[PDB]
């Protein structure tokens, strides 16, 4: 499936099985634009997080309960949700994915 394929390709499951990972299907510029949108607090308490005004297309990749390195197995769940990312640097761009509502 898409998750097992993209996780491997992006060097995410080549040397380990990462429990979860979300892929955003919007242009990179549109995602970077979120850093100037709705300012909220990151679950960790920090406040350099921003929620997207609109929902975006995303694919949630979750490891099955059976997955074990080297045979990682993922469950693919497509959806449209508001993304929340932590921004920093100059330019101000996303460095962490916080959640999706």
């Amino acid at each position: 499936n898409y998750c097992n394929q993209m996780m491997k390709s992006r060097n995410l499951t080549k040397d380990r099985c990462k429990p979860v990972n979300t892929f955003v299907h919007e242009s990179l510029a549109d995602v970077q634009a979120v850093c100037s949108q709705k300012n909220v607090a990151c679950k960790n308490g920090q406040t350099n997080c921003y929620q997207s005004y609109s929902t975006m297309s995303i694919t949630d990749c979750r490891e099955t309960g059976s997955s074990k390195y080297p045979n990682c197995a993922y469950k693919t769940t497509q959806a449209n949700k508001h993304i929340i990312v932590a921004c920093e640097g100059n330019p101000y761009v996303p460095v962490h994915f916080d959640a999706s509502v």
Partner: peptide, 15 residues
């Protein structure tokens, strides 16, 4: 090598 913004792109971007 890989900056934090670069890593976010490799890990989560799939336009």
């Amino acid at each position: 090598k890989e900056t934090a913004a670069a890593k976010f792109e490799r890990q989560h971007m799939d336009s």
